[PDB]
Symmetry: D2
Subunit: 293 residues, 4 copies
């Protein structure tokens, strides 16, 4: 039952990008055999065999991990003529680490039920540095017994597994954390922009904010990087802004007013428009440029 390497050695990835490839390396170290599918056929890992379709990927894996950008990519690869779900055996596990909507999560869970496949919604908190060090925090929705089955996989890629509740709970908890992260950055960029506009020395201001208790450790790391103009993508603007769009849609469906998060989303739209592929913290540089002019 437990998906240890002896019981279920073959883990197939649907999607194999910045996070998934780093996850795969820790799973390979833990004793699993890794394979992957991507629409392009390329991936950052040359030694990982590539399968031609999602169906072919699923037909030769014991467990499937999904790590795709959005609802549309998830639907493109799980359903249809060559979709992954129909390639899985009854009683097997699908682990979705993608950041997708509650609706996409419910659709996949239901489709899994029809095929006899248990789908865990297990998005992660942490970016590429945390993927590198296997210090991700797994946010998982599903039955306790199914989370237990996946324990060795979660343990290999992360430092902590939070059982958020039944199916859908992991996806919702991820949306919560994404909103905190996105609005924390827009808040910081706007506050820095006011300080600079009001004449504060840039080097003094960036170093002073490293000393205050009201900024998170994640955002202090972004602020230090931004002092250096370093926006190499850990979490690109295109993905952060998509997560903000998903959160605002979910909050509207629940009829919860979230004006701070809604404002932050618009700032991250501007960030994405100006540079989709650099780190989402580049809004700091955007705001600096506004006040320079």
């Amino acid at each position: 039952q437990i998906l240890s390497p002896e019981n279920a050695p073959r883990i197939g990835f649907i999607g194999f990008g910045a996070m998934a490839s780093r996850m795969g390396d820790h799973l390979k170290t833990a004793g699993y055999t890794i394979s992957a599918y991507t629409p392009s056929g390329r991936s950052p890992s040359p030694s990982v065999p590539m399968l031609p379709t999602p169906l072919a990927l699923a037909k030769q894996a014991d467990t499937v991990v999904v790590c795709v950008p959005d609802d549309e990519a998830l639907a493109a690869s799980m359903y249809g003529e060559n979709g992954a779900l129909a390639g899985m055996t009854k009683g097997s596990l699908l682990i979705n680490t993608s950041s997708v909507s509650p609706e996409a999560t419910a659709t996949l869970y239901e489709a899994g039920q029809k095929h006899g496949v248990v789908v865990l919604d297990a998005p992660v908190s942490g970016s590429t540095p945390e993927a590198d060090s296997a210090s991700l925090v797994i946010l998982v929705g599903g039955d306790k017994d199914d989370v237990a089955r996946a324990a060795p996989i979660f343990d290999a890629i992360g430092k902590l597994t939070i059982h958020a509740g039944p199916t859908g709970s992991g996806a919702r908890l991820k949306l919560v954390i994404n909103g905190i992260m996105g609005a924390g950055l827009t808040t910081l960029a706007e506050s820095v922009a006011y300080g600079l506009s009001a004449g504060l020395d840039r080097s003094m201001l960036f170093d002073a904010l490293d000393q205050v208790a009201v900024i998170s450790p994640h955002h202090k790391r972004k602020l230090k990087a931004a002092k250096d103009g370093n926006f190499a993508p850990q979490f690109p603007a295109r993905l952060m802004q998509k997560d903000m769009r998903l959160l605002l849609d979910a909050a509207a469906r629940e009829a919860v007013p979230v004006p701070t998060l809604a404002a932050a989303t618009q700032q991250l739209s501007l960030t994405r428009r100006l540079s989709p592929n650099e780190d989402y913290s580049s809004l700091i540089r955007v705001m600096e440029k506004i006040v320079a002019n």
Copy 2:
């Protein structure tokens, strides 16, 4: 000219509330003689003038621009009682305009005014772990160092006059919008069916919430909004920041949204901690 206890033993306070009384206690331990004036009435003095006449250094801790003007200016105000060459230290959270007015007025009296607001609330004042954010001349900041060292753990020299007031506004914005962001995000999670205890405990484990805001979240788990920084003062600070950002023509939509949420917070409970917005949002969702 350094303002050590042996050189300037008498520190007189204009305003003596939660923060100031805690600062005054730490300056007493450091060896200064504390006096104070408050509108309501440590030895107390009946007027700002009387307070400044019997003090070597004056420290101001008043709520807003209006209180600052009422106690600094005029024949019974603090400046009229001060002597050329002395220092006034304003720790109040006031506008850049009020700061510039007081600096210029101080100059006419031969008094150097340091704008030295602080980061940290009553727990930080209790433990003298405040961060002092001070604007002024390098040598005047040095004159005040023993006072700043008694009440805090770090003095940040932010620049010339007005730089401390501006840096406090920056930090206020981060603090206020950090709270409104957290309240809204928790509200979504609860509205989407997440178990309350699970959600509060999970958020204590993530790296994207500040230590300050994680403390607020733990208190909110218990419905505890006893004031450390009351909604009326946080919302006032947000009003000041948004006024200054408008005068500088800097678009700050996240801070503007947070300000409106803190207006609602103040309306519903002006005196409980500003983190009570967490409760306000829980009640909306419920």
Copy 3:
């Protein structure tokens, strides 16, 4: 080719609510034979059965999910229409749902016009709707008798998808127009202005739209009988914000308005979306 009563007398509706019924009254007067399907309950049992006995299909459903439920599959409307026929979608749905339906119609040889309308139940009563239509010029001309009977003006917005997009533009203006007015009134009341003075004064200024002045007059009397319910206005705002995020366009005023309309929907989903005026009055009155 033209869908006159002579050439295409039978118009079948998918959905038949507040606007679709009023739409049908005018098409009846124009000489068409009206039939309809709704999931509740001349009424036909399925969308398939509806389409089989209609010459033109008009769709008026609340959201993307309802559109997909009734459009697709063996019991869906498309499975029952003939190549060369035309489906007119007047529903307020997403650009994504619009594109999906257009492509599905192509596979069946069916042209899908996205023709949402501007105007509410009073304009549907008087055939005063403005039709906002995307499609080929020749397909739009085919539908002209139908658009002329239900409305006063047909705007050809561009190719397929252009009507859906133009509707989203107009929905943003309508929604944020109301939230702006509700907050401005709220500030006025909180600052002590007489309520009847204030409502009457705003009726006389040139910066409020005729639509919003009619809402303001109704709100003066506390009348929020639904013409456009909060649940549907807030859904339209959700769609617009999703579309604006997909296009990466920053729209802070529209995003703020959406959050106020989420509160409005939560407090009263079925009253007119203008009830936010009352919601804000109650915030100010405590």
Copy 4:
């Protein structure tokens, strides 16, 4: 008592810019004698006598009308030995048409009481085209008997006098109306921007929006001008954004949450930063440039 041209022919202006000079022409037509003071000594009407100080203006005028940009300009010319109040005679009327804060309004009313001068806060709704046609709406605070005294002056410059309440009521009603105007424009600019970003033809879209009932007559006029790129200053961004700052300060003092107005203010800050002196409707062009990227 009634301030008709017969009883009180002389009207002196403190400030004489775009609005005040147009008011002056209609008062001249109604049979008043016009004089003015500006700090610069010049005005768009070269046929009107200029006075060197506010004090000198008030000494030779029966009623004084004030039309200055902001609180700071108001205090500079009302107070002190050279100010207008020092030159007015007990029992005369001061009519302030400036858009200033409720605090500045209360200060000037109390100061006028000390001098025996009743101050009416009478800002106006309407811009330069309405001033040209005397279609202004006067929003006046004060006692009904003092409003009645000023009726012939209000009638010559406007089409409707709204008695908003006691002192301070006109200033507050002007703030209400300014917020509707400002956020009406930012709403329209953002909605147009979405439409353009989604591929709608520019000419089609501007013309289509002229046909819908959810845009005000004022903003329809701005939309037509914006199609033409015409942002000649009727109401410059620097003054609109100042008015929004005043409204958001007042709303914060009243603890009233106004998120749509707050969002609009930030958009008008960007507008002012990019072009302070063009019409405030230039945000439409700003947003078009953002989507052109």
